[PDB]
Ligand binder design. Structure first.
Ligand SMILES: CC(C)[C@H](NC(=O)N(C)Cc1ccccn1)C(=O)N[C@@H](Cc1ccccc1)[C@H](O)[C@@H](O)[C@H](Cc1ccccc1)NC(=O)[C@@H](NC(=O)N(C)Cc1ccccn1)C(C)C
Length: 203
């Protein structure tokens, strides 16, 4: 199958005899599920994201079915707004990112999908992130007017500066779109620019 990124890549998993909805997320190392009470023992863990850390419980060897495909791995359970399928499970279902309509350059998720971007006129690297609505870069100087905005993620909300109609080159592809600038741990390329450069998920 192929998943487009016009929408959030939400899918049905099953985890127990339960269907759940979850987000297919290439920028997440880990898989995070909403609070549910599993039998088993767990380890305490702190995970971070945009706006800070939350505490989670780590369960090992959970089996999930993602789109008729089985995966077995570590899941973290906690007060997440959304169930996130991270690269630890996505690699097991054979999921790749493909640019150019389909293979096309093909990117595996065994490691973090980091690429070089050129943004006026520096090179940075950024994570290709199918779970993000928006593109968030580290603090930099872009020419143009901006406005304050707030965005959130795991851990909460950050204040960003929004610039519209900015040119960016992602792997030699041009995109012209909105970029948020603020105190993000990582440069994130989200669905707003991913779609411009013809990125899909395939398995
Ligand atoms: C779940 C965590 C275990 C995960 N963290 C994580 O993997 N690490 C910290 C390790 C790491 C380090 C360096 C590089 C890569 N990975 C995480 O938050 N990953 C982010 C990307 C990120 C990595 C590192 C630092 C900061 C961010 C996700 O991949 C990213 O897609 C998240 C997912 C998300 C979405 C909704 C709610 C919670 C989490 N989106 C976001 O944080 C964006 N927000 C949204 O898009 N929304 C809140 C809208 C929305 C609503 C509903 C559904 C989806 N999206 C920001 C960037 C604008």
């Amino acid at each position: 199958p192929q998943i487009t990124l016009w929408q959030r890549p939400l899918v049905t998993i099953r985890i127990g005899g339960q269907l759940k909805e979850a987000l297919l997320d290439t920028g997440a190392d880990d898989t995070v599920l909403e609070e549910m009470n599993l039998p088993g023992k767990w380890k305490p863990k702190m995970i971070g994201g945009i706006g800070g850390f939350i505490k989670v419980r780590q369960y090992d060897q959970i089996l999930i079915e993602i789109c008729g495909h089985k995966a077995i791995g570590t899941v973290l359970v906690g007060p997440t707004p959304v169930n996130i399928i991270g690269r630890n499970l996505l690699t097991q279902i054979g999921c790749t990112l493909n640019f150019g309509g389909s293979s096309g350059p093909q990117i595996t998720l065994w490691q973090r999908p980091l690429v070089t971007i050129k943004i006026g006129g520096q090179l940075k690297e950024a994570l290709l992130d199918t779970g993000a609505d928006d593109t968030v870069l580290e603090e930099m100087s872009l020419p143009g007017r901006w406005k304050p905005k707030m965005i959130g993620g795991i851990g909460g909300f950050i204040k960003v500066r929004q610039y519209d109609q900015i040119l960016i080159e992602i792997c030699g592809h041009k995109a012209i779109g909105t970029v948020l600038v603020g105190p993000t741990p990582v440069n994130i390329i989200g669905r707003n620019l991913l779609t411009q450069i013809g990125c899909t998920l395939n398995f």
